[PDB]
Amino acid sequence: STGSATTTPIDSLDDAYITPVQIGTPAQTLNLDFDTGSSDLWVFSSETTASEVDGQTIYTPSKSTTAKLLSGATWSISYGDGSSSSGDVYTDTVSVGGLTVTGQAVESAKKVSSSFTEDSTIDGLLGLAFSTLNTVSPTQQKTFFDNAKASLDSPVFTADLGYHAPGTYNFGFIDTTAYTGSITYTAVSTKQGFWEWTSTGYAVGSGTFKSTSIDGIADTGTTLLYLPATVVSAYWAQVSGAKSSSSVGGYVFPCSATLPSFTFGVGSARIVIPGDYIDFGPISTGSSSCFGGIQSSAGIGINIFGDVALKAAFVVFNGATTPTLGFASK
């Protein structure tokens, strides 16, 4: 089997991407944030505290003939941005882009933090990291990809995120028309439950490439590119007027700037992030100070290849017995 679904930016800044997901019988379609940095499939629901719902589409298990309460199971998750959610668990039929999993754990939110409530466009998350991070207790549950894997033509999914435009998540096949040149594959460590890999270095603009190992995670659920302070300082030093602002919470730059590209290494290959991808616009409406798309990972504890980086590539998440990651230009 295979699946193919279009993923669409939630706003003009590509702050996140939503992909339609069919849950239950008859289908209830919710727009979920596919997140390769977590492993819970959770949704706004009929059980969510009413004051914490503001425009989201909810899953109502009682209206699904295939929904079954997973008795005794609860979940609770906290994300890197400080947001969180928790609730109980149903199993139900879940389909993405024509690919169907029966008995998928669907984590129903009883509580969500303000960031989720305030984002009307995201109806929940679909985790695509390794199932060892799944928060369901007392019986840990598998991700959608893990459940689908055996049925897929090939044990892979691909992320093809757009810049200011729709893209695609495919399951079970590599669309050879979706990228240019070759795909370069690189080793993955699953020791922390993430798609963790080591970039071979970077360049700023038309500058020379610096060979240096940068361990980080491929995380579709994180907006920006978070790298070591040395790397980030070298980037922003090429933008006149750029500075790190503690009051804003990162590097800002004059909105009148033309930003240089940023290149990262994948083995001997190179992925180029155009400068425009690194512009996240005014810090506040009407401001001429703009927020940077490359920020320091210092104090996160991990480097994160978020959407800024991933959307410059066609990315293969290879879930073979020994997982690997593939990157191609596009």
The structure tokens listed for 86 are 């928790």
Question: In 3D, which of 14, 48, 8 has the Cα closest to residue 32?
Answer: 8
The residues near 201 (Cβ < 8 Å, ≥ 6 apart) are: 209, 210, 211, 212, 213, 214, 264, 265
- 181: number of CA atoms within 13 Å, CB side? 14
Q: Show the CA angle centred on residue 163, arms to residues 159 and 168, nearest 5°.
A: 30
Q: In Å, what is the CA distance from 103 to each residue of 24, 94, 123, 287?
A: 10, 8, 20, 49
Question: In 3D, which of 172, 168, 154 has the Cα closest to residue 2?
Answer: 172
Question: In 3D, which of 178, 184, 182 has the Cα closest to residue 160?
Answer: 178
Exposure string (b/e) for 270-282, b if CB count within 10 Å is 16 or more?
A: bbebebebbbbee
Q: In Å, what is the CA distance from 14 to each residue of 211, 238, 241, 278?
A: 30, 24, 24, 11
Q: Which of 14, 35, 88, 119 is catalytic?
A: 35
Q: In Å, what is the CA distance from 34 to each residue of 5, 204, 222, 282?
A: 11, 29, 10, 26
Question: In 3D, which of 161, 159, 131 has the Cα closest to residue 144?
Answer: 131
How far apart CA 88 and CA 77 sit, in angstroms, is 12
Q: In Å, what is the CA distance from 150 to each residue of 63, 73, 91, 156, 325?
A: 29, 25, 19, 10, 19
Q: Show the CA angle centred on residue 33, arms to residues 226 and 160, nearest 5°.
A: 70
Q: Dihedrals φ, ψ of 309, to 5°?
A: -80, -50
Q: Which of 86, 108, 199, 261 is catalytic?
A: 199
In Å, what resolution does this model reach?
A: 1.5
How far apart CA 222 and CA 18 sit, in angstroms, is 13
Please report, for the chain, the start and end positions of each structural domain, with discontinuous segments joined by +. 5-174, 175-330
**The CATH number of 5-174 is which of 2.40.160.10, 2.40.70.10, 3.40.50.2300, 1.20.58.220?**
2.40.70.10
How far apart CA 3 and CA 168 sit, in angstroms, is 10
For the sheet containing 243-245, what is the strand order?
243-245, 250-254, 289-292, 279-282
DSSP, collapsed to helix, strand or coil, labels residue 35 as strand
How far apart CA 249 and CA 232 sit, in angstroms, is 14
What superfamily would CATH give domain 175-330? Acid Proteases (2.40.70.10)
Beta-carbon neighbour count of residue 317 at 10 Å?
23
Helix, strand, coil percentages (3-state) for the chain, rounded to 5, are 10, 45, 45
The residues near 54 (Cβ < 8 Å, ≥ 6 apart) are: 117, 118, 120
The structure tokens listed for 173 are 């096949």
Structural contact between residues 202 and 49, judged by C-beta atoms closer than 8 angstroms: no
Q: In Å, what is the CA distance from 229 to each residue of 226, 234, 303?
A: 9, 8, 10
Which amino acid is present at 303?
Answer: N
The two beta strands, 41-43 and 99-112, are parallel
How far apart CA 18 and CA 125 sit, in angstroms, is 9
Query: Catalytic annotation on 199?
Result: yes
How far apart CA 196 and CA 215 sit, in angstroms, is 7
Which structural technique was applied?
X-ray
Q: Do domains 5-174 and 175-330 have the same CATH topology?
A: yes
Q: Is 15 exposed, middle or buried (0-12, 13-18, 19+ CB in 10 A)?
A: middle
DSSP, collapsed to helix, strand or coil, labels residue 115 as helix
305, β-bridge pairs: 218, 225
310, β-bridge pairs: none
Question: In 3D, which of 281, 279, 280, 287 has the Cα closest to residue 259?
Answer: 279
Q: In Å, what is the CA distance from 328 to each residue of 95, 158, 173, 269?
A: 27, 11, 15, 9
The structure tokens listed for 136 are 């369901």
Give the 3-state secondary structure of 38-101. CCCEEECECCCCHHHCCCCCCECHHHCCCCEEEEEEEEEEECCCCCEEEEEEEEEEEEECCEEE
Question: In 3D, which of 10, 38, 6, 88 has the Cα closest to residue 219?
Answer: 38
